[PDB]
Amino acid sequence: GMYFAAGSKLVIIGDSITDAGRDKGIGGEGLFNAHGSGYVALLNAHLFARFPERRLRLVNQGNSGNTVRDLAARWQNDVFGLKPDYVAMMIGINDVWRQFDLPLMTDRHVCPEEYEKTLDELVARTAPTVKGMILLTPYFIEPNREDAMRARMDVYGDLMRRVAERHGCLLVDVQGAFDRYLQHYHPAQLAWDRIHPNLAGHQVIANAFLAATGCLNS
């Protein structure tokens, strides 16, 4: 990883896409199923196999169902309390998703304003204490750009972009990565619910991250 200094610890935090069914009892680092079976585990395998010398220490702090509201509540213990050199954050999917599968529960919804304010605040507190901070855009595996949820997901993605630019964060365009993939297959080939993909879908996410950090190839 060119972007990452050698021997650095990277903490990746987010929802179930980050979680990927890890054993939370271990705390992100461990021997068996500490990273789950998603893109985080793919990143860890990729970096070890292609860059053994780089000695990168990856931590999975993904919690299923989480919004940016949930992230802020546990940020002290799950991010700062681990003393990371780098922090990668991917959040927004559930923030957007609840507005569509639970449209009547207004109280639950995270409005664009709250999403920006909270996301910007987490970054503002974390940016100086780390060597680098990576923001991975939320996505919707749906090529239809005028789909209510896809268009809404695009709103939150753009919002994450102007936060990354404002604090000099690295932005991984995961949505764009899926958009390139979807030129060849229907979303069903990746994810029935257009959110939780198979291993191939997680590889799309992982490869977007690696490319943005300049360690896709070796």
Q: What is the DSSP letter of 72?
A: H
Reading the block at residue 169, the tokens are: 């964060």
Q: List all residues 6 or more positions away from 85 whose beta carbon is below 8 Å from its beta carbon.
A: 4, 5, 8, 9, 10, 130, 131, 132
Q: How far apart are the first and last CA of the chain?
A: 10
CB nearer to Cl ion: give 95 or 154.
Answer: 95
- Minimum CB separation of residue 193 from Cl ion in Å reads 10
Q: For residue 16, state whether it binds Cl ion (rule: CB under 5 A).
A: yes
CB nearer to Cl ion: give 16 or 44.
Answer: 16
Q: What is the DSSP letter of 15?
A: S
Which residues between 35 and 94 bind Cl ion (CB under 5 A)? 64, 94
x-marked contacts with Cl ion along 128-167 as a string, rule CB under 5 A = ----------------------------------------
- Where is the chain broken, named by the residue before each break, C–N > 2.5 Å? none
Q: For residue 175, state whether it binds Cl ion (rule: CB under 5 A).
A: no
Nearest to 209 by CA among 6, 15, 18: 18
Q: H helices within 51-111, ranges in order? A: 68-78, 93-101
Q: Which of 120, 167, 179, 196 is catalytic?
A: 196
Among residues 15, 95, 142, 154, the one that binds Cl ion under rule CB under 5 A: 15
Query: Does residue 16 carry a catalytic annotation?
Result: yes
CB nearer to Cl ion: give 33 or 64.
Answer: 64
**Site of interaction with Cl ion (CB under 5 A):** 15-16, 64, 94
Catalytic machinery residues: 16, 193, 196
